[PDB]
Write a protein that binds this ligand. Structure first.
Ligand code: C2E
Ligand code: C2E
Lengths: 249, 249
């Protein structure tokens, strides 16, 4: 009596699938450890990744659904849901967490306010949660500035990720008080085996260091990459080398 | 008996206008001094700018026609013409010059060979002429590498310009033996009045210096911008502050 069809690239299927998941809270929290380059047994925080566990049992990665949530203008609904779930699960432990915010939320000032209202409701978790924005969807300088101020006021921290293409604006970061900067994986990929990549990394680390901004390398896959990242003095690392995204533990 | 019409955005007019200019050698050489940031009375070279002097007497800037030469696939014809004219006018003096090469020329291996043939014909000017490529139209790493090798072999030098967005590849420049790197004007614009721009410039200068690659700032307009560029240790400057593009002298 129960049939299933392949959803593929069908906008109808996706629309139905996602509106339902949003309404029914079908999204679950996955985590990846973010860890000190100098001593990988030392955990900085756990990055929270969104997982859709559909009715047929399969888990769907944020990389897969986020573009559809965008297309339908629901990314703000996702953040509201993700943020409330994360603030709830943090009651159970003492670890620090990082969670993305999309531009849809930052642009829409009502949504953005709702976020702050929620945060204000859990000022006791402030020190344990960092919000991240991917370089792809940075708002304007003045929005960055107001966002960081409000968060610092509420007791929470802010960070950027997938950083690198916009090194231009490194100077513009000097007063934001970011917790850290996550460097896109492409700039460290196979860097033990591609030394020409090092000079850029050396430049970012030195400039970021002069403004007190720790660097954390993304998507580290290899003991080789890790050894270079560590050698060159970066603060943190994350990636498949420390495991796949998994549920809490 | 002689009438003229406005050429505007008319592809027909432009096609006719440019094919004629190319065939009849209607392009003239303009120059801008490129000068030491530490001592602006000290001239590094003169950048050669292409000017179309049409029949109605008006002069048309490369910025205006190059996009049409592209559209029609004639940019290689322009380089051949520009390069031969430049090598001819250098016989008259002892100044150093810099001249662009387009991607159309670098891609087409026959054209590229013609260039080398011409260069080989004037090996006596090698030390006085630098070829430049804008960051917009950099070829692949291996083409850059072969191009620089052949030029160094012929006795000529090579440089990149409008550099900045691709700081990623700074490491990839370490063995090219570029004569210098020209920094896009946007990174120094009003930099005495926009200090957040300095940290990026500091990063480029330090990384470029570690690989022996002098930095030269483009499109400097202001005594203020100049004073910062000089303070921060960059090698060279060019722009409207030292005059408009004019014919030889
Ligand atoms: N090739 C490679 N890939 C690796 C490696 N390590 C982790 N990854 C993958 O790349 C992403 C890493 O997490 P992210 O940087 O936070 O990047 C995140 C994050 O920016 C975003 N995202 C995830 N959850 C949320 C969310 O709840 N809200 C918002 N607005 N965005 C989210 O989308 C990305 C997540 O996509 P995911 O499908 O979860 O894909 C994950 C993860 O599975 C590695 O060593 N190599
Ligand atoms: N806002 C501002 N602008 C300034 C300033 N100083 C100079 N400029 C302008 O910007 C360009 C500077 O020369 P360029 O960097 O070599 O940049 C050149 C060069 O890359 C290219 N080009 C010029 N001649 C040739 C040529 O013979 N062959 C090729 N392939 N390209 C050429 O197109 C550009 C020239 O366009 P132009 O129309 O000649 O425009 C010139 C010039 O008039 C300044 O202080 N402020």
């Amino acid at each position: 009596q129960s049939l299933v069809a392949d959803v593929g690239d069908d906008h109808h299927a996706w629309h139905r699938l996602l509106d339902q998941a949003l309404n029914q809270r079908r999204f679950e929290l996955f985590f990846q450890p973010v860890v000190a380059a100098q001593d990988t047994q030392l955990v900085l925080h756990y990055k929270v990744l969104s997982r859709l566990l559909d009715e047929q049992g399969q888990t769907i990665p944020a990389g897969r659904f986020l573009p559809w949530l965008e297309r339908f203008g629901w990314t703000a609904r996702l953040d509201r849901l993700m943020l409330e779930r994360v603030l709830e699960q943090m009651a159970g432990h003492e670890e620090s967490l990082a969670l993305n915010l999309s531009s849809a939320t930052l642009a829409d000032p009502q949504a953005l306010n709702k976020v702050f209202e929620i945060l204000r409701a859990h000022s006791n978790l402030g020190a344990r949660l960092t919000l991240e924005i991917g370089e792809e969807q940075l708002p304007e300088q003045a929005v960055l500035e107001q966002l960081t101020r409000r968060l610092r006021e509420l007791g929470f921290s802010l960070s950027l990720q997938r950083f690198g293409g916009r090194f231009s604006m490194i100077g513009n970061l000097a007063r934001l008080g970011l917790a850290y900067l996550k460097i896109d994986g492409s700039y460290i990929r196979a860097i033990d085996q591609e030394s020409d990549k090092r000079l850029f990394i050396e430049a970012i680390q030195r400039a970021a260091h002069s403004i007190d901004l720790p660097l954390i390398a993304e998507r580290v896959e290899t003991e080789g990459e890790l050894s270079v990242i560590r050698e060159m003095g970066l603060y943190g690392v994350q990636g498949q080398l420390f495991g796949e995204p998994k549920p809490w533990g």
